[PDB]
Design goal:
It is classed as fluorescent protein. The entry lists the keywords Green-to-red fluorescent protein, Dronpa, fluorescent protein. It forms a tetrameric assembly. The entry is titled "Crystal structure of a green-to-red photoconvertible DRONPA, pcDRONPA in the green-off-state". Four copies of one chain form a homotetramer. The first copy, chain A, has one domain: Green Fluorescent Protein. Chain A is globular. In chain A, a hairpin with a 4-residue loop joins strand 2 and strand 3 (about 35-45). The first copy, chain A, has an eleven-stranded mixed beta barrel with strand order 1-2-3-12-11-8-9-10-4-5-6. Chain A has one helix at about 75, and strands at about 5-15, 20-30, 35-45, 80-90, 95-105, 110-120, 130-135, 135-145, 145-160, 165-175, 185-195, 200-210. Chain A is mainly β and about 220 residues long.
Chain lengths: ~220, ~220, ~220, ~220
């Protein structure tokens, strides 16, 4: 049920600082190559009055290249699928939380995403749209209470230099019993490859690969 | 346009650990006495698989008794009203965030509430429904960036003793220009007065009073 | 063995952002009235390159007025005494941690204090010495694992208005078995009454009172 | 002033939950190989009533292998040296903070370390000594206010499975003006290679290598 080429359809509904928005996307990815791409359109709440970048990691670790020697929690979970829950705590007190319920219909993954954020300062980099991109990162994954956790300290690069930090904590929950992996890592890189002026239209790419870190 | 007795209608839509739910409420309160009560009904997602208590502070500081010597940000904001944004960070890593948009229709406040929480551990007191009540508390309120902030370290009492801590951070935003207050406090006390077995029906009370502290 | 008037001697050794310092103090207080004062002198590391205010809460809850209806963990612990451990997490990522070991010699409490802080930004209000005073506050106290916990969200007022928040988490540990109290509060107010230009010499006051909250 | 083989002498003084201790160490490392090792002896406060593992990352990024294409803040800082300040926030509310002032005398680095920790629960993995080792990790490094920051979400493996998380935030401060690097990573792995029963004697090794993460 996992093919080398898969399709993606998503809808995100959410709010930031109380202002509602919705986004839909269609994309495709290569589960065994750890690559995916997507075209996204703002359907409600546009033009978004906050940095689009805070949304992009919400738009599926199935699309991570896993080696033979590491248990792949995500690929095992299908056809039933899995869901995730995530908090994103920014250094200036802004906080977002999101969830994705991921199902499979034929060769198309369907994401139902909810995203909510609060307490972003009016003069902060998020509401003033001064973010440039996410730096690449390494997520740490480990088992807790029979489910899988993923943590990572991320950073947005800012216009005119400097970085803006965010601590991500994710819980991933398979919809059926699956084999549990040992502690491992997923390196990833997410990139807006193109966008129009107010980000109503966005082409988004991600590359991700699991590994076991420095040996000995 | 603020009367001694006012009505309340609310809808909350939300999710905890990805589990969607919705609650409706009707109540009434006394803005100048700092009291309010309401009846709440789970309309979707019932029976709620998490402690009801995490929701109750989301179910309006206009219902706080303010003395003459303290600027009342909330009462000033009407008829236009105000909105709030809040994060609630629990000591075991559970996080909720909520927003309320509050408007006025005649004598009736209307709340549009959104509530979301994630990362509550399966074995923790929230998902295990081991909470008893919120202890009384005191919110600290202060101005930042031309809007009003409210912070408080809250605690839930737990079944079989002990407490479970949660740090609240709220931003309040008037829909019009109002006078901004100096640093002050709001003491409050929130109580579920009655409920049925699975909390499908709940009668909720709050009492709150602003003050300027210890000399 | 607790008298209406008691003396205090302390030494604090510490470091902020890796910069070592040391302070000595002599003072006196009134355990049953919940008042205390003291004179403090920087002995090493002067002139301190950070806001003095971050240190003052480290410079003893025995000097809190407890009513009859609340168990007094602190007064019970003497003559053996008690110790405390505390973290202070500021909103800009600055972190301090402190410990005090408190003993009794005749009529004189002796404090051995250690204080350390890191990650205060160069441009932040602590390293820029832009703090004015701590606002009055209310500590929440409650039992966990047979010892007493104290939590409070504190705020420093800043020069030119605005506030700077800090979350306090303390653990208090009696040196002997004592009666454990129920959930309660300690209101307190701490003030630098006088100081010289670079805070080499400081006269510090505190007033504190326990209570059970809002009904 | 940077040699392929360098010596290390350190003293750490500190307290955990108010109980004071002191440790001294002698070791050596290979700055260009990103390898170092050390023998440590508890001089005061033994036998330590808490997990030794909380101390080990306090016992110098000079010993990280840096590629040509990444600015090496640490090697540049010598002979004058640099200092660091660090907070370590554990998921059960335990908190440690430490500082190291690092100087150079001939071919020997001298570390003066202070370490303080509080609010470790009596029944937690630290006071009950149920930690096994630190998992390998990837530190994220970036410039802020003209100094270098390093953040990483770390994890201790626990006896009988499971992990215990800790968020590290470090500030590194060169003692002279040096070139500032772009955002980068340092993968590392720290290991107690041998110890006696109560950890009075410990042989500690670390391997570390800088890189720039996933490309494109």
């Amino acid at each position: 049920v996992i093919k080398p080429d898969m399709k993606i359809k998503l809808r995100m509904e959410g709010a930031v600082n109380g202002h509602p928005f919705a986004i839909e996307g269609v994309g495709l990815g290569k589960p065994f190559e750890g690559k995916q791409s997507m075209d996204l359109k703002v359907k409600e709440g546009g033009p978004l009055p906050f940095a689009y970048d805070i949304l992009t990691t919400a738009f599926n670790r199935v699309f991570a290249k896993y080696p033979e020697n590491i248990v792949d929690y995500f690929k095992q979970s299908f056809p039933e699928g899995y869901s995730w829950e995530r908090s994103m705590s920014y250094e200036d007190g802004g906080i977002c939380i999101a969830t994705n319920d991921i199902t499979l219909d034929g060769d198309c993954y369907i994401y139902e995403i909810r995203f909510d954020g609060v307490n972003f300062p009016a003069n902060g980099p998020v509401m003033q749209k001064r973010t440039v991109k996410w730096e690449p990162s390494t997520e740490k994954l480990y088992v807790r209470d029979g489910v899988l956790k993923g943590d990572v300290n991320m950073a947005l690069s800012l216009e005119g230099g400097g970085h803006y930090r965010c601590d991500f904590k994710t819980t991933y929950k398979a919809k059926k019993v699956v084999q549990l992996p040992d502690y491992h890592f997923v390196d990833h890189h997410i990139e807006i490859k193109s966008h129009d002026k107010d980000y109503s239209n966005v082409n988004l790419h991600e590359h991700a690969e699991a590994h076991s870190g420095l040996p000995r």
